[PDB]
Amino acid sequence: SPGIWQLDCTHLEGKVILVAVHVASGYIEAEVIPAETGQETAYFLLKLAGRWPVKTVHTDNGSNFTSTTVKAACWWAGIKQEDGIPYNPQSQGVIESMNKELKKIIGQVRDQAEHLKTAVQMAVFIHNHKRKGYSAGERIVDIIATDIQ
Amino acid sequence: SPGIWQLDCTHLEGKVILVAVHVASGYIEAEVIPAETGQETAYFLLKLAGRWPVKTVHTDNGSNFTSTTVKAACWWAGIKQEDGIPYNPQSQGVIESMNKELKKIIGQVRDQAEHLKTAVQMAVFIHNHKRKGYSAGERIVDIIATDIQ
Ligand SMILES: CC[C@H](C)NC(=O)c1ccccc1C[N@@H+](C)Cc1ccc2c(c1C(=O)O)OCO2
Ligand SMILES: CC[C@H](C)NC(=O)c1ccccc1C[N@@H+](C)Cc1ccc2c(c1C(=O)O)OCO2
Ligand SMILES: [Cl-]
């Protein structure tokens, strides 16, 4: 549970926003890329896994699941790559609602930066610090610390 | 001290590696940029502060300390920007030895990627997971959890 992340890819302004969600906490990391390739996905996972103890990633589609670049990066970083199949049918909705919520925050901050990437990082900040009582950022830290002990 | 970070800029292959160190733990985040500008520094701090509860940043030089772009991002993210003067002189040496250690890891992984940025993320991963007994990644999480509770 403390090690499980879901990949999610969403679109805005003709660009792609790649998101990793820590499932148990709702904490997120995100980046803007011109399009989702195996190489961009591989690099984003490498970044993520040097920052958090990533044990399992539920990939966002079959092309990243198949990608030899993604597989090489998951091997390198000690990540088990799984499918993102929502056997739990409530997962489709949780991700859709997160995408909708992130896009709302981005629109709330959009005018405070020229570049999309900046507004996306502002939205990451607001999402992770929002108390819901603990924030997503407090929850992930608590979950992993508990796991270390 | 759970909220205290130090900025550090080092050079390799004609590029710049911008590093943020969590002082209490030795945990690091890093990125490759073509050169250290206020805008790059401001963006890197915004990413960092959305991911960890950053209270104070000891800036790496006076140009970033002075930079209106850096000050606007520190304001935006709730960060107190401080100077990075080693009033405690053991601070210069710890940073130097960190840059030397990072560069050694980068050369050990260097052949495992074409792009410098990839090797830097590999080095961040190895640095943060090296158990020294806990890793830097375990120490940062323990420090911050204790602070929430
Ligand atoms: C040179 C003029 C710039 C483009 N300013 C604006 O247009 C502008 C427009 C509105 C509000 C603020 C700004 C100020 N801005 C610098 C915030 C910023 C900092 C760092 C970054 C950014 C950006 C960004 O704007 O996206 O992008 C990646 O690193
Ligand atoms: C996990 C690394 C694996 C074990 N190494 C190799 O397969 C390897 C080794 C040497 C040369 C090329 C490669 C292949 N290459 C595509 C790696 C890679 C992935 C993602 C990226 C990259 C790069 C990069 O090469 O820099 O740049 C930004 O996003
Ligand atoms: Cl800003």
Side-chain angles (χ1 to χ4, degrees), chain B residues 71-136:
Chain B
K71 288 176 184 303
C74 290
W75 169 77
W76 195 96
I79 305 169
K80 176 167 213 169
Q81 186 209 220
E82 293 183 3
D83 60 64
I85 312 162
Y87 307 100
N88 165 23
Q90 288 195 321
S91 308
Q92 308 155 77
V94 169
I95 289 337
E96 260 151 10
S97 290
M98 191 192 72
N99 288 338
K100 181 176 173 166
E101 175 222 319
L102 269 181
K103 280 169 186 184
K104 180 180 186 210
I105 308 171
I106 294 168
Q108 290 172 356
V109 303
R110 189 64 188 84
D111 63 322
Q112 292 177 56
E114 180 183 1
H115 306 123
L116 182 59
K117 62 185 227 174
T118 311
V120 167
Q121 301 310 317
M122 291 176 167
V124 166
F125 180 108
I126 291 166
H127 170 92
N128 290 340
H129 284 82
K130 191 170 181 202
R131 195 162 279 111
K132 289 190 75 196
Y134 293 90
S135 71

Side-chain angles (χ1 to χ4, degrees), chain A residues 23-124:
Chain A
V23 177
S25 65
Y27 170 95
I28 72 175
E29 302 228 1
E31 70 169 21
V32 179
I33 56 181
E36 192 178 36
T37 60
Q39 191 152 133
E40 293 294 349
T41 303
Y43 185 65
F44 177 74
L45 287 172
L46 179 55
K47 298 194 279 187
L48 185 73
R51 288 158 183 66
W52 292 104
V54 185
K55 172 201 192 196
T56 300
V57 168
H58 294 277
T59 45
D60 54 331
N61 58 51
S63 298
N64 275 336
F65 185 64
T66 302
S67 162
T68 57
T69 309
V70 171
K71 285 184 193 303
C74 290
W75 171 78
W76 196 95
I79 304 168
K80 295 166 138 202
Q81 187 199 35
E82 293 182 2
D83 53 65
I85 302 171
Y87 310 96
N88 183 0
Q90 290 207 124
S91 304
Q92 297 102 112
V94 158
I95 284 193
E96 141 221 279
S97 282
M98 188 198 69
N99 287 338
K100 184 163 172 169
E101 180 250 7
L102 265 177
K103 277 168 187 185
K104 179 165 87 136
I105 306 171
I106 294 165
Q108 292 173 359
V109 304
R110 192 59 193 82
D111 68 331
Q112 287 177 66
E114 180 177 0
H115 304 117
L116 186 60
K117 62 181 211 171
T118 313
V120 167
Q121 296 314 317
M122 289 173 165
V124 169

